[PDB]
Write a protein that binds this ligand. Structure first.
Ligand SMILES: CNC(=O)NC(=N)NCCC[C@H](NC(=O)C[N-][N+]#N)C(=O)N(Cc1ccccc1)Cc1ccccc1
Length: 497
């Protein structure tokens, strides 16, 4: 029954708002009018981005924003709701530029959530902005609160939730209640900052939208897929930072939940969330990229995968060599390292020297330019079949993507996602999910159903013996054990009845 969420970011920089126009793509490449009624029907949420937190510790527009122009842009988005009574226009606070550890507004994020009074003032500003501009909910994209700030962040979400609920009552919006989401880490290293308190983070949210992309980039030594669904044993692996989180678990519990090293994949991030007690699968949304990440200086042999590379990691892109052959948008944006799916289609179609290759373990496409040594990791309508099937099988809440302007003109990526979830005639029952590496971790939140003989008092159990007892299946960690399962540290809870 329940419709999967389809959450698309609409990003527009301040300069484009201030010069907003729907008839000049060299000024605004992707105006609201490109979101046609058909696209609007295929979305459940549009996340308008980005607002910020100012030094007054309130949610605010960038202060250079022309306010009349901003209201006009937002009004155009909310007018889309005429075509889809399920559709919400959220607004997002944060993003990497504003909120990263070294970002321009970082201290405002830290300070806004720091004390009860600050949280109240911040929470109020969020709901006030929401009402003033006509938004339908609040998305927080702070990348990322550090373990010490996590309790404040949690209390801030709780308080926003209460104020949103009041507003839903005041406006009689029970048919479309005001919502709260966050953009969550999609890889273990950032996730470990708040992982131990994941259940408290998710409780106040309608959805946690996993940034399950940007898992490879120029900061890594070796090229890799940025959003592999499953792992490739030929690919790099990473230290599992979650095993060092402050969980209070035992060695066996830690080891069973957090294999290490592990493959940095979409399935890993999803499973890591599901392992936590009190994190329901319906609130987890899988992010996907509508862009590819490009690398230069790559060697041959494996289509450019898992190769050293000479891609600058600095920001801004440090020179004017725009080496991603055929990428016109790269020239416009002065950066050959990111290419929209829209542009990648054109690069494939023109005489630019790319081959489209497919990794059947990761279930993702990549471009390889044999002559110049280039590699591009991206997603398309094919990789989205496997991802949508995974979303259905794991009973996730839906899909999120960055960003709407990166789909092709016909919006084929959005239309594919919508089709995989909702088309009566689409059938993926035979879609083969392949033999790529699954994240095998098990934690208190995802115990498999098991059976085993009932525990018998007085029996001496050898190491590895399985019994059932009080709702669960238990395994001895050593032998010989005679204690009742769960009464001391000799038994590992491994499954549920
Ligand atoms: C909804 N929120 C998000 O999707 N957030 C998000 N992806 N955060 C990760 C940000 C890292 C940043 N990513 C991109 O630029 C992806 N863009 N697209 N499409 C990133 O790669 N870098 C940090 C950065 C980005 C922009 C401005 C300053 C810093 C490093 C980088 C390396 C190579 C090219 C571009 C950026």
């Amino acid at each position: 029954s329940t419709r999967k969420a389809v959450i698309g970011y609409y990003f527009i920089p301040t300069n484009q708002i201030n010069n907003y126009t729907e008839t000049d793509t060299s000024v605004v490449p992707f105006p609201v009018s490109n979101i046609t009624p058909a696209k609007a029907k295929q979305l459940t949420h549009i996340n308008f981005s980005f607002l910020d937190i100012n030094s007054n510790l309130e949610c605010a527009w960038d202060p250079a924003t022309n306010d009349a122009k901003a209201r006009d842009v937002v009004n155009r988005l909310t007018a889309l709701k005429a075509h889809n009574p399920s559709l919400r226009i959220m607004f997002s606070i944060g993003g990497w530029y504003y909120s990263n550890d070294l970002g321009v507004s970082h201290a405002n994020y830290v300070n806004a959530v720091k004390t009860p009074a600050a949280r109240t003032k911040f929470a109020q500003s969020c709901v006030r902005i929401m009402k003033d501009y006509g938004f339908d909910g609040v998305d927080i994209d702070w990348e990322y609160p550090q373990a010490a700030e996590v309790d404040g962040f949690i209390a801030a979400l709780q308080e926003i939730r209460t104020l949103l609920n009041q507003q839903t009552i005041a406006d009689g919006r029970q048919a479309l209640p005001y919502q709260l989401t966050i953009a969550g880490a999609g890889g273990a290293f950032f996730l470990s900052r708040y992982y131990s308190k994941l259940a408290q983070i998710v409780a106040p949210l309608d959805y946690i939208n996993l940034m399950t992309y940007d898992l490879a980039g120029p900061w890594e030594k070796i090229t890799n897929h940025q959003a592999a669904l499953f792992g490739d044993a030929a690919g790099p692996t990473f230290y599992n930072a979650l095993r060092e989180a402050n969980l209070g678990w035992s060695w066996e519990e830690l080891t069973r939940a957090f294999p290490s090293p592990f493959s940095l994949t979409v399935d890993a991030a999803v499973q890591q969330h599901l392992m936590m007690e009190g994190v329901p699968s319906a609130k987890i949304v899988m992010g996907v990229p509508f862009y590819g990440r490009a690398f230069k200086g790559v060697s041959g042999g494996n289509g450019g995968q898992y190769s050293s590379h000479s891609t600058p990691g600095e920001d801004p892109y440090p020179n004017a060599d725009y080496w991603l052959v055929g990428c016109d948008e790269c020239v416009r944006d002065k950066d050959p390292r990111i290419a929209s799916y829209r542009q990648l289609e054109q690069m494939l179609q023109g005489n630019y020297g790319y081959q489209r290759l497919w990794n059947d373990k990761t279930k993702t496409p990549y471009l390889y330019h044999a002559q110049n040594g280039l590699f591009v990791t991206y997603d398309d309508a094919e990789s989205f079949k496997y991802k949508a099937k995974y979303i259905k099988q794991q009973q996730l809440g839906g899909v999120m993507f960055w960003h709407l302007g990166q789909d092709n003109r016909n919006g084929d990526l959005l239309a594919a996602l919508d089709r995989y979830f909702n088309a009566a005639d689409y059938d993926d029952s035979q879609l083969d999910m392949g033999t790529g590496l699954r994240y095998t971790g098990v934690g208190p939140g995802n115990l498999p159903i098991m059976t085993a003989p009932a525990y018998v008092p007085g029996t001496t159990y050898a190491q590895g013996a399985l019994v059932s007892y009080q709702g669960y299946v238990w395994q001895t960690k050593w032998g010989y054990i005679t204690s009742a399962p769960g009464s001391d540290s000799a038994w590992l809870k491994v499954g549920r009845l």
